[PDB]
Structure formats: C-alpha cells, structure tokens
Amino acid sequence: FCGSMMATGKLLVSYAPPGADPPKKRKEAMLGTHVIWDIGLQSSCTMVVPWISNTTYRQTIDDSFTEGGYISVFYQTRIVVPLSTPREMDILGFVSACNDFSVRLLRDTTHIEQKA
Amino acid sequence: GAQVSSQKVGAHENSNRAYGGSTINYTTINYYRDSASNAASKQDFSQDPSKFTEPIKDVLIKTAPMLN
Amino acid sequence: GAQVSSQKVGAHENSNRAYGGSTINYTTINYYRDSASNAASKQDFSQDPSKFTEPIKDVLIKTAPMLN
Amino acid sequence: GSSSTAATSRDALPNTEASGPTHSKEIPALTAVETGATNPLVPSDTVQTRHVVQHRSRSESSIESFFARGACVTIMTVDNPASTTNKDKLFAVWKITYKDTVQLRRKLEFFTYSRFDMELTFVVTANFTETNNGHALNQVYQIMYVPPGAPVPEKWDDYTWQTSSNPSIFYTYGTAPARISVPYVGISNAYSHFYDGFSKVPLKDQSAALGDSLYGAASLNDFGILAVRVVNDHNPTKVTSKIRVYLKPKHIRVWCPRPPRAVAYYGPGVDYKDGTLTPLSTKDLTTY
Amino acid sequence: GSSSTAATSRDALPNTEASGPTHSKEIPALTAVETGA
Amino acid sequence: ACGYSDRVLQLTLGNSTITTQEAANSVVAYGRWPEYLRDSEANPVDQPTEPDVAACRFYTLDTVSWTKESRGWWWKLPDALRDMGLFGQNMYYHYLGRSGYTVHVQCNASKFHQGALGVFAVPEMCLAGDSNTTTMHTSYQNANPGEKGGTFTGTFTPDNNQTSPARRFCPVDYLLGNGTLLGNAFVFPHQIINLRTNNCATLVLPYVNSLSIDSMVKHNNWGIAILPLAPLNFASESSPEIPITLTIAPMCCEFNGLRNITLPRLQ
Amino acid sequence: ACGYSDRVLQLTLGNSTITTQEAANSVVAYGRWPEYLRDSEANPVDQPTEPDVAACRFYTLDTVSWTKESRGWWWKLPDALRDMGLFGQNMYYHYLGRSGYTVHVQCNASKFHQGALGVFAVPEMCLAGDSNTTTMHTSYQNANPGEKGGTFTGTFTPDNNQTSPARRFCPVDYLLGNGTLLGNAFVFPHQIINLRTNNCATLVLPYVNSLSIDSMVKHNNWGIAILPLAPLNFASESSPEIPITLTIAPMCCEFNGLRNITLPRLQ
Ligand SMILES: CCCCCCCCCCCCCCCC(=O)O
Ligand SMILES: *C(=O)CCCCCCCCCCCCC
Ligand SMILES: *C(=O)CCCCCCCCCCCCC
C-alpha cells in the first residue's frame, strides 16, 4: 500500500481455481482462496496461490486444458482518509515463486528476436 | 579410471532383473588431459535463495511482523 | 560399470568349451546420464491375467458351479 | 565394476500334466459368463491328457517386445531451389503425433494409457526434379524441435534457426540416419490415447462460441512441432528432399486394454466414415 | 580403477505438510516489502 | 450351510441399501476397489473436500424401456450424476474431483422371457460423431446428456446439414459406437444380464485416469454401455417391453479447488 | 520480543484468511470453542455429514453503511449463511444440522473519526413484532432476511393494517429489539468497535441450544446485533458515512437426516 499513513482500509485478494464464471463481483471472489488485507503498519500483504491443478505441470502458453484460474482484488470495506489527506493513492503488486516451484523442457523464448 | 554414477530413472521398463529397478548406473571415462575437454557431469548443487530473497541484516521470522 | 547377463540360447552350435552350453552371457554398459538414452533390456515380467479374466469379487473355483 | 544377472517374459509356460478318466460332481466345463469372468480351463479339465514338458514362452509378446520397432509416423518435404525462383524455399513444419499414419497408432490403441521413452530415427532422401544436368553439393539438414510456446520459423533462414535453447539435429546427407531419445515427457502420469472430454467448460453466462472446443482434444498430447530445413544456400539446380520419421516407444508400460480399431481411421479422433463400416466378409454359418 | 557415485539439482522439492485452521497472533501473510526482502 | 449365495446380495452405502436375489456375483473392475488419493500420488495441495455419506450413496436414474427394437443405451460418469444431490453440488463447486462408483443395473422379467444385455464399463469411452465433413465436432451439450443417457443405433446416418450441423454422436451398435467390434467389448469390465440366469449387473469401478485428479465437468472417466447381445422375446408376443433401471453410487469421492459454482451451458 | 500483539491477528479457515492490525483481542463465547457432537451426547443415529473445509470457511455478506442516522443492524445464524456456498447446500439437503461460527465484523475509519459499535452475539435472539393486536405473528419470511439482515429502529410503530398485516419485527434499539434494556446486552458475548481503538470485532461462537442438534431451517441458534453505542462523527461533516462488513465462518458443522433438498418460501 503506498497511500499516506493516515489512510486506512480493508481489501480482499482472491484466487479462484478455473472452471467457473471468472469473478467479477466480490460475492463470487470471496468463495475461492482469499486473503482479507487490513492496511496498517505492516505495509504489505501476501496471498499464496496454492498449486491446484489437474495436470502435474501446466503449459507456459495460454491453453484451456492447463488453465490456472483467476486472480482478483476487491474493496472489502473502503479506503478511508481524514481531511487534508490524498483521497487517491496507489498500490503496487509483486509476484514470486514458492519453494515448491519448478519448470521443465527448455525452449527458446518469443521475447527476443533478430529480424534479418 | 572409470567413473560410475547412477541415473535418476523416469519411465521404467517392465523389468527388475536388468532395467528399471536395481539402480541403473552409467560409466564415464575421460579421454583428455585438459579438463575443458570433459563433458558436463550435470551432477549439480542447489542453494538457498536467501542472498537474493532475504538480504536483510536482521533475520526474517515469517510468522512475526517484518517491522518491529 | 558393466552389466553382465545371460542369453537364452535357441540354436546351439556344436560347442561346449566356448559356445552352446557353458551359459552364454552378454555385456551392457550405459554411456549416457539420461536413462531415456538406454537401450531396452527386454528382461521383462509376466503377470497373472486375473484382473481381466476373473475380475469377480468372490473367487472362482473352476471345479465348482460358477453360480451358487 | 560388473553387476551380474518373479515370472519373466521368457520363462517356459506350464507343463501339461497327465490326467485320466473322471466321473464326479466336479464340473469345470459348466460355467456362467454372465458373471463377467472367463472360465480358466486347461485341456486336462475336459479330455484325458499325457504329461508334456512345455518349452514355449511368451517372450515375444511382452509389451516391450510387441512395441520394439521403429514405425514411420510422418514424411516431411523440404527443398533447396534456385535464388531466382518466384517460389519460396520450402522448409517443413510437422505437429508431432503418431496419428498421421495408421500402423503404430492401431497398436498403441490396444491400450487406453501408456508411458514410454521415445526413440526417433530420421531417414533422409533427396532427388533432382528439373531435367537439367546442373549439380548440387552434399546437403546438411537442420531438424529443430520447437516446443509449444517457442517461435515457429516463418522463413527457412530467419532468427529462430539459431536454436539457442530448442534442441536441433544437424544431419549430413548420406550419413547414417539421425537418432535421438526423449524421456517420458507427458504433463500427465501417463500419455492418454483416449480422452473422453473437452478442454473447455461452456458456461451459461458466456457465448456458445467462447465456450466451444473439440471433442476429445486436450494439450495432454500437444508436443509441439518439428521444423526442418536444408541449411545450404540456394543452388541453381533445384533439389527436393524427404525426411521420414520413425518412432519406437521403448521402456514401455500400458494400461486398460481395448478392442482394436476395426474400421478405417478417420481423423485424429475415433470418428468413422460412411462406406467404411463393413469389416467382415461373407461366410455361411455351416460352412467350414 | 572405478570411482563410484549437499542439496543436488535433481533432488525432490519439499513436501507439502498437512495444516489445519488457525487463529492467533502469528501473521505470515502481513509483511513489508520496503525492507528489500 | 447358512445358505449364503452368489446370487443373493445386499449393498449398503450411506443411507441406501440394494438387495438382489438373482445376481451373478459382482465385478470389481481390474481387481481394484475404489480408494482415496494417497499422499504419495497427490497433486493439488489444498485440503480436499470429502463428502463421504452425503455423496457416496445410491442414486437412481430415470428408467428406460427395453423392447425388440432397442439397439442399446449409454451414459458417461460423472456426467450422469451431475444433478444428483450433494454429489452434483460438490462436483460443480470445485475445479477438481475424483470418484469411483458402484454401478447396479436392474432388469427383471420372468422364466418365460428371454434376452441378454451386455453391461460394459469403459474407461475413456470416446464415441464417434455424426459428421463426414468435420471430425471431433460433437458439442459439449450433446456429448453430455446427464442422467437420460443416449442411445446406440444400428445405422450410421451422416449429418448433411452444413448450415447448422447437429453436432452429435452417431454411435453404431456393432462398432461399440467407437470404431471397434462390439464382440470384443468383453475385454472391458462387464457383466451380462441374461434373463434366464440373473436380473442385475453390478460393477464396482475404481477412479481410472492418467492423472490423480482432474476436471469432472470437462472430462468423463468412465462410460457405461448397455447393448442387447440377444434380443428381448416373450411367449409369442410381438411387442414385449421390460424396464431397465440404473442405480449408481459414487465411492471415495474427493474434491479440490473450491470456488463459486460452475454453471454450465447444457442445452 | 518478536513483536506479537493483541491487536494484530491472522485467522485461517479452509481456503480463507483474515488479517487485522487493529484488533482488541478476540472473544470465545462463554469460554467454549466450537466442537463436533460427542458420542455421549449424540442423538440422530445415522452417520452425519461433516463438510469440513467446504463449508468451514469465511463467507462475506453484503456490506452495509453506517451514518449518523443509523439505529443498528441484526442478522440471525444459520439464516444469514443459508445461501452461502456448500454450507447453504448442506443445510438445505439435511433435516438436521449444528454449527459453531467465527464472526468477524469489520469497520475502519481514521484517527479523526469517532464512534462506537456494540457487537453482540445473542443465543436465541427472539425479536419483538410490529403488532398490537396479535402476538408472535412475524412471518417466517420476515423473521429470516438471509444475508441482508434487518435493522433496529428508535421508534415503535404498530402495524394498523388488520386487512393485510405486515407481519414483521419492529425491534426498538434501546430495548434490544426484545423488551430488555440495551445497556445490559453486555452480559451476552460481545466486543465494541470503538474507532479510536480498533477496527474490528471477532467473536468465536460454540453451537448453543437446548438440544445436541436441531432444524437449521426452522430455528436460528444465534443472533448478531450491531448497535451504535456512540454515534458516528467526523471532522465537522454533517453526513459522514463508513462501511461495516460482516464475514462469518461456520465451524465444526455437521448434519443428519439427508433427503431431497428443502425449497423454502422466502418471499
Ligand atoms: C530434435 C528432436 C526432438 C524430438 C522431440 C520429441 C518431443 C515429444 C514428443 C512426444 C510424443 C508423444 C507420443 C504419444 C502421444 C499421445 O499422448 O497420444
Ligand atoms: C581407468 O581408466 C582404468 C579402466 C580402463 C578401462 C578401459 C579404458 C577404455 C579405453 C580408454 C582409452 C584411453 C583414452 C585416451
Ligand atoms: C564400469 O563401467 C567400469 C568398467 C569399465 C569398462 C570399460 C568401459 C568401456 C568404455 C566406456 C566409456 C564411457 C562411455 C561414456
């Protein structure tokens, strides 16, 4: 959370494993894996996306058979600020692998090329 | 001067008097004096990622507040 | 790291001081770290067909009536 | 140093035991196939038998031995034309599968699931096509495995052939057929020869087009492609080449036996085509 | 003559342990990325 | 001694019991009783839901009718149970699920009737489509009939409407609806209901798949195929009919990846 | 030492986690943590369903808004969770059920806001009706609002339409909606959300009843009542508003007497 110290709020961070309507309302997102984040002196909050998959490995391309599901963030209560305080502010998000994470079948990337 | 090492077997054939089970080994003999000529052994080590994931001076206890 | 195994000899040459009789063996050495690189050993196992031929819950005694 | 080597595939089958006349309440011959069981009889249950020391074995019908052969799974065409051609130099792209041909496919489809290491062998042949006397120097071919997600080549000479990470084979014409092995690479615990399902659940709240997918298809079997090119630059006399790919499944296990394909294959699924549904021929019930 | 062969690259990753409901002052989920960790 | 018999069985699961007095023993497919997913084979790491008696109990599907013209019937699992009580709810609320089953097919008649039904349980029962212009085109809706199941036909009839294709299966009976000869379907776990002998078939099915757990909503693990190996006949009547009823209990079902409920397009 | 604190908590149930950094410890009602029904106190003999993580997880209800005119809000349990995922399905498929709960009320504001909410959990929270011509007449539909809950009022207003009576509760705030003084509601398990101190209330509720298990569809075991003990204020604004959100997790829920699903008349 990068708002001022005077700003408070509760947010809901959600992971919905695939196969149903992707959550567009808190009511649905709240039924999947989720963390309700209370903003405060510990500035940050982590939601773990547990490995939940039919296959033992997923593809590194968009693919329905090995689709992974939906990540979403909602307001749980609302951001509240006192007077003389910015009413808008930013949050930044980060992603990282857990210690049970692995990859295989080395391949070239589409993220670089050399034309002619 | 042979080096004998074990293979990590993935698909196992229907066999335990020759293949799949009774540890399958492989053999390497280096033919050259220069070690740059050697094949790669691939017998490699892992390490804890902490020098990148937790480079903080005072130890991180995850159940505790990071800021205290 | 050689594997020595025996051959099942079919036609035997007129010899028992070298071929046909005194168990003829063969040798295998794996040259690669990946077991997928290995040849097939063909030293394979058989099993009873019962999971397909007799998948009934109560044991079949062939001399008895199947229905009783 | 030296390693030296419970019913095995090459063991002799059971001996026939001698058996004599019988008169009793034991009834091996009578049975009831409604139970789902096959009656486990041997000849001494219904005739008099002599003793026979059995030497035959089932060594050649073990799963490994039934499959221990390279089978052709595709033919890839490539060429190396003059630089003055209106037509582009042909490189080939093949989506890896055993379903473009029928013989190996039918054998694997005696089973529902399998696990194996795959040996691929490549036979390469070439020929001239224009009745010309011009010549060509010995060709080198690049066989590049492009796994799902990696950039597929669009030109015979674009950057993707750099292969920094894809495995490639550079094969020299006229040498022994190329060969590699691959491990069991499935994203499941076994390859599925049959998948009774879809890759997408159509949702009520979504258009039919958005929830649609092919019956029986899944990335369970998307293994990517082989891309093949003649590495040599354009030559004034055109040469055409073919790469035949042979697949041998080695170190194999299989599960859940199935009736074999009895009418002609019709696409990569189990579909059949009108006019091919009559495998049996005419034979009269009381004619030998 | 013959030589024959600590976390190695081919070792299995850690098991997932079973864990149940929780209600306490332990707060793994809350953190502070300002620290650089 | 006490008179226990192959033919007389009682099955009890959850709050439900089946009795039969004319059974022909019962089959455990591939010799494997259903089981929960072992830790050494596990894959989703979240704590699974295991409904136990709420879902592992006998559900009876709509009864069908066997006549001299019947060519056969088919159902898919878990699909045929998708709308069955708490089994159905647990299936649709979770991304993943696995389950074994006890399948009990019921069909009684009289000592003067005759006929024989082959009851086959087929792992990955992929069926052939109705098209000779597109392959693998049967739609999700037509591939998944739910409890009413579908039927076999004696004749392949290609769909020629290319404007709006029917997109359904056209499963020919002597080709087991999949391009292989019906006479060989006996390599699949099966029983035969031959009316002079028995009035039911019982098949206990382990979860079978190339994965420990998978999407039940996308994928059927087992098919049930019922075909008349010998046609129905009775006294000298031209149009006899007798009912066939299916009752199926999930066994050892467990589910992972809980979220909002799946609401599938089924028509 | 490590900095653990009363004010900073994490709650995890099933696939759901709550964090708070401004708690005021948490309450375990009557000192009794929720538990499954012991064999020595058991009563229905059928094997119970225990959904475990499928239903024992945090469900968030629709958020409400606190303003200077708010008189208070109420909900009943299990009623407020009747339509919540697999908890709701298990409740309606079974004649009997029991459950405990973790109730977490959320309401943050700022160091310049003030106000205090009493959060009370009341066993058998019977509320008064709107009629002075008939007693005990509130209808099932009006007594059970589901997740939207109901509200308290500062004024008793008798329903005078005897032709078509409204049949609803008229719960007066200072009489705790039941004829007793609100100042004494603190003998019930409670916490206060006083905005300068804390932004949440957490109440762990054991199943409480004069029976080991009962009809969840007929009977609510607990009521949650939230009333402003000190009104909302902020800087010098005339109409401040701040949201209040309820999140509730069933705990140790078990069910008996499985049958077809209950389909209640709720409007
Ligand atoms: C340079 C050569 C690379 C060769 C790359 C081989 C890539 C993997 C191919 C998998 C073959 C799978 C056969 C079974 C398919 C199935 O599931 O039906
Ligand atoms: C260790 O090296 C002694 C065992 C020797 C085994 C046979 C060696 C095979 C041929 C190696 C030739 C020398 C290579 C330059
Ligand atoms: C066991 O392997 C020790 C005995 C060694 C016998 C000679 C080895 C023959 C050459 C193998 C070379 C290495 C292959 C990569």
mmCIF file of C-alpha atoms in Angstrom, chain A residues 5-6 8-10 12 26-27 30-43 45 76-83, chain G residues 15-22 57-63 84 106 108-110 112-113 147 199 234-235 237 241 243 245 247:
data_model
loop_
_atom_site.group_PDB
_atom_site.id
_atom_site.type_symbol
_atom_site.label_atom_id
_atom_site.label_comp_id
_atom_site.label_asym_id
_atom_site.label_seq_id
_atom_site.Cartn_x
_atom_site.Cartn_y
_atom_site.Cartn_z
ATOM 1 C CA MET A 5 -0.038 6.774 6.911
ATOM 2 C CA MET A 6 -3.395 8.362 7.734
ATOM 3 C CA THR A 8 -6.898 3.045 6.207
ATOM 4 C CA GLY A 9 -8.773 0.235 4.513
ATOM 5 C CA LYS A 10 -9.547 -3.413 4.047
ATOM 6 C CA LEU A 12 -9.947 -8.731 -0.395
ATOM 7 C CA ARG A 26 -16.839 -9.758 -4.516
ATOM 8 C CA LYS A 27 -19.623 -12.294 -3.761
ATOM 9 C CA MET A 30 -14.978 -14.476 -1.763
ATOM 10 C CA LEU A 31 -15.919 -18.105 -2.361
ATOM 11 C CA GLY A 32 -12.443 -19.020 -3.625
ATOM 12 C CA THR A 33 -8.999 -18.866 -1.973
ATOM 13 C CA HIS A 34 -8.557 -15.401 -0.499
ATOM 14 C CA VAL A 35 -6.914 -13.083 1.982
ATOM 15 C CA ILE A 36 -8.658 -10.102 3.572
ATOM 16 C CA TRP A 37 -5.956 -7.468 3.920
ATOM 17 C CA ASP A 38 -6.101 -4.926 6.678
ATOM 18 C CA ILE A 39 -3.994 -1.883 5.791
ATOM 19 C CA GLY A 40 -1.757 -0.682 8.587
ATOM 20 C CA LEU A 41 1.826 -0.539 9.918
ATOM 21 C CA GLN A 42 2.809 -3.800 8.200
ATOM 22 C CA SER A 43 2.536 -2.192 4.781
ATOM 23 C CA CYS A 45 0.123 -8.398 2.345
ATOM 24 C CA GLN A 76 -13.665 -5.197 1.459
ATOM 25 C CA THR A 77 -14.734 -2.064 3.326
ATOM 26 C CA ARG A 78 -13.406 1.116 1.566
ATOM 27 C CA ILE A 79 -10.284 3.288 1.720
ATOM 28 C CA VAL A 80 -10.876 5.953 4.353
ATOM 29 C CA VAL A 81 -8.841 9.117 4.846
ATOM 30 C CA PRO A 82 -9.218 12.083 7.257
ATOM 31 C CA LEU A 83 -9.311 15.649 5.853
ATOM 32 C CA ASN G 15 -9.110 -21.682 1.842
ATOM 33 C CA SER G 16 -9.641 -18.327 3.562
ATOM 34 C CA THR G 17 -7.575 -15.988 5.681
ATOM 35 C CA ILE G 18 -8.395 -12.798 7.559
ATOM 36 C CA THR G 19 -5.792 -10.359 8.791
ATOM 37 C CA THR G 20 -6.241 -7.437 11.132
ATOM 38 C CA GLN G 21 -3.836 -4.878 12.510
ATOM 39 C CA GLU G 22 -6.219 -3.089 14.909
ATOM 40 C CA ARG G 57 -14.521 -21.088 5.756
ATOM 41 C CA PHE G 58 -15.054 -17.324 5.716
ATOM 42 C CA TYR G 59 -18.132 -16.063 3.870
ATOM 43 C CA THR G 60 -18.524 -12.270 3.409
ATOM 44 C CA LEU G 61 -22.058 -10.879 3.480
ATOM 45 C CA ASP G 62 -23.243 -7.712 1.687
ATOM 46 C CA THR G 63 -21.677 -4.614 3.183
ATOM 47 C CA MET G 84 -23.505 -19.394 1.200
ATOM 48 C CA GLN G 106 -15.063 -5.045 10.024
ATOM 49 C CA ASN G 108 -12.267 1.046 9.746
ATOM 50 C CA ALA G 109 -12.163 4.817 9.652
ATOM 51 C CA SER G 110 -9.411 7.311 10.583
ATOM 52 C CA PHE G 112 -10.101 11.877 13.095
ATOM 53 C CA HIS G 113 -13.323 9.859 13.072
ATOM 54 C CA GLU G 147 -27.588 -12.144 4.425
ATOM 55 C CA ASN G 199 -11.401 -1.527 13.526
ATOM 56 C CA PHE G 234 -16.093 13.073 11.648
ATOM 57 C CA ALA G 235 -14.143 16.360 11.452
ATOM 58 C CA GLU G 237 -19.017 16.995 8.478
ATOM 59 C CA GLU G 241 -20.557 7.504 6.206
ATOM 60 C CA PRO G 243 -18.977 0.855 5.708
ATOM 61 C CA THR G 245 -18.669 -5.573 6.639
ATOM 62 C CA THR G 247 -17.545 -12.074 7.405
#
